[PDB]
Structure formats: C-alpha cells, structure tokens
Curated annotation (Swiss-Prot), chains A, B:
Functions as an androgen transport protein, but may also be involved in receptor mediated processes. Each dimer binds one molecule of steroid. Specific for 5-alpha-dihydrotestosterone, testosterone, and 17-beta-estradiol. Regulates the plasma metabolic clearance rate of steroid hormones by controlling their plasma concentration. This is Sex hormone-binding globulin. Residues 4-176 form the Laminin G-like domain. It comes from Homo sapiens (Human). It comes from the Eukaryota. Isoform 1 and isoform 2 are present in liver and testis. Disulfide bonds join 152-176. It is found in: Secreted. The chain holds residues 42 to 217 of 402 of the full protein. Homodimer.
C-alpha cells in the first residue's frame, strides 16, 4: 500500500489541500493509517473558515490532540494512547449527530459532544482539508505546537470523494 | 477494603457531599476504584458555584464522560474504555497546570487543556464535591443523563483532606 511523508521540506505548510462541496456530502468520516516516532505535530486540519470555523487533529506528547473552534465550541483536548511508537495505527474521525468521534486502532477513544450541527446544513458550503499542516499560522492555534509531523500516511479516505472539488499540493508528494 | 454503594434509594441525590477550603489545598488529585454494570450515571460532581463553576464525571454508554462549565470552558466530552464490565477500575482525576487529566487503570485517557487557573487562586474559596449525584437538577446539565449510578466505590481520596471543611450524607452510606 502506497504511503506518503506527512512533512515536506521544513514542514511549514501542508503537503496537500483538498476542497469539498458540503452540499454533496453523504459521508463525513475520514480514515487513514499513520506511522511515526514524532511526538508533536499536525496530522490534518479542516475548516470552512480559518478564523472561526476550524479543526485540527495532531499529536502532542505522542498522543492525539484535537483543537476545534466554531460557533458552538472552542476546545483543546488530548486523548488516546501514544502513537509515536513507530507502528502503523488506524485512525478514524467522524460525525455522529452533533458529536465528533475519534477512533484509534478500532477503539473509540474520544467523543466531543455538542460541537456541531449537520455539515451539509452549514453556512459556507465549502470545506478545506489540509494534511500535515494548518491553513493559518501555528501561533494562532488555541494552543500552539510545532506543526511539522515527521511520519507516514497511507490508506487515507477523506470525507466524501464525490463531494471533492479539488486537490492541490505546494510541492510534489514524497513516498515513504 | 470497605466499599460503598454510589446510589441511595431512588438515586435522585448524592450519597455524600464534602466541602473544602481552596486556600488550604496543596493537592488537587482525587482517586478511587469503582465497580458497576450500570452504563449511565454520575460518579462525582464538583463546584464552587452550581450555576457557572461546576464539573461532573460520570458514565454514558459505559464510558467516562466529563461535563464542565466555568469562565474558561464549557464542554461535554466522552473518553476511555467502558467501565461497566463489573470489574474494579482505578480512576484518577487531577489538575496539571491549566488542564484536567483523567486516568483509568493507570493510563491517561483524557486531558482537557486550557480549562482552569490555579484552584487556590480562585474567586470563591469553597469547593463542594458530591458523590453519586449532582448539586443541581440533571436537566440543567449541558447534556442531561439520569444520575443514578448503580455501582460501588472504594479506596477513595478527595482533593486535600487537610482542606476538607465538612462532610454530609442525606442518608447513611450503605456497604457493598
Ligand atoms: C471533524 C470534521 C468532520 C469529520 C471529518 O472526517 C473531518 C472534518 C474536519 C473539519 C471539521 C469537521 C467537523 C465540523 C467542523 C469542526 C467545523 O465546525 C469546522 C471544521 C470542521
Ligand atoms: C476537576 C477538579 C480538580 C481535580 C479534583 O480531583 C476534582 C475537582 C472537581 C471540581 C473541578 C476541579 C477543576 C476546576 C473546576 C472545573 C472549576 O472550574 C469548577 C469545578 C472544578
Ligand atoms: Ca514534530
Ligand atoms: Ca444508571
């Protein structure tokens, strides 16, 4: 299975950005496998607005961390086991009603409840997903961390491929 | 080791309430072991103000759930494995800087960051801890649940015993 490096060069920007049309979404889940020895960094970021409607899944002290900022909630939460042990880990993020669920290696490790309304029914119908980086300065995070994540990603599926509008990459993706 | 039932009668109120003087606190951690087959309910509640400075640790769908409401954050978060398997489980809740940490059976399963300033340096210097129930109607929770927790508690330590002002129990505690 083809795998890509989650950091390019200095690791100051995402390795890829995908844009989706929220009105065409019929699937909200995203899943992938990640391998790394890096204890801190951004796995993926998402927003419909970089100022007040954004989300970030990363690692801090080797463990998953989600920072989220929208009309309903603003939080910085760590959960789950360390993933920086150099082993492949299955990760899944999805919506379940008004909640965001995080599953690691088959187990639910975190459920952020009351954080969102239906996606398709959101104001701005365009969602951006960035891999290995944010779409705003790391210093503007609720809790800053250094975004560079020295790791590999494979078997990824992002939201609903049928709603994907476009995909870009500042620089060509590197294979692991 | 002596153990007590976490629910008395209809399970509409806590089995015990302890009050502490925050200025005398030198230890914030609380720990105990719990056993139960009940998937939903309140393990313990805490506040300095039932309207806008409160906290609740309970179970929903068998898993830990924390609801917290204060000047800095307002959240409803689920995390960790199910604990309603009828086996004894070690649980520890403590402050680590501005974060609230939750450990289950020796493992950190949840860290709510940026949710609080130093306790000793809080406005109202009195904190109440209630076991097996809340100090306000369940309907006023951020996300209501039925508080009755049919389970047993033992080996409990609450905050700093040297700062404990008093302890009450609506009805006499029952042994498991
Ligand atoms: C977590 C989700 C959904 C599951 C999907 O698998 C990944 C995306 C990333 C973007 C999140 C969105 C949930 C809703 C958010 C928090 C909006 O309020 C602002 C950014 C959005
Ligand atoms: C979680 C803590 C601390 C660890 C201790 O072991 C238990 C108590 C319960 C009460 C919490 C407090 C943390 C600060 C809170 C959220 C205040 O803002 C309002 C209620 C307080
Ligand atoms: Ca890193
Ligand atoms: Ca119950």
């Amino acid at each position: 299975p083809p795998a890509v490096h989650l950091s390019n060069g200095p690791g100051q920007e995402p390795i890829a950005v995908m844009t989706f049309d929220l009105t065409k979404i019929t699937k909200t889940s995203s899943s992938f496998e990640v391998r790394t020895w890096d204890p801190e960094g951004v796995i993926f970021y998402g927003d419909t607005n970089p100022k007040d409607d954004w989300f970030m899944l990363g690692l801090r002290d080797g463990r998953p961390e989600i920072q989220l900022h929208n009309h309903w909630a603003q939080l910085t939460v760590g959960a789950g086991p360390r993933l920086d042990d150099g082993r492949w880990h299955q990760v899944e993020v999805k919506m379940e009603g008004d909640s965001v669920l995080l599953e690691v290696d088959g187990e639910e490790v975190l459920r952020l409840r009351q954080v969102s309304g239906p996606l398709t029914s959101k104001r701005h119908p365009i969602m951006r997903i960035a891999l290995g980086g944010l779409l705003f300065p790391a210093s503007n995070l609720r809790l800053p961390l250094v975004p560079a994540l020295d790791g590999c990603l494979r078997r990824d599926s992002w939201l609903d491929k049928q709603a994907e509008i476009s995909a870009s990459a500042p620089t060509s993706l590197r294979s692991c």
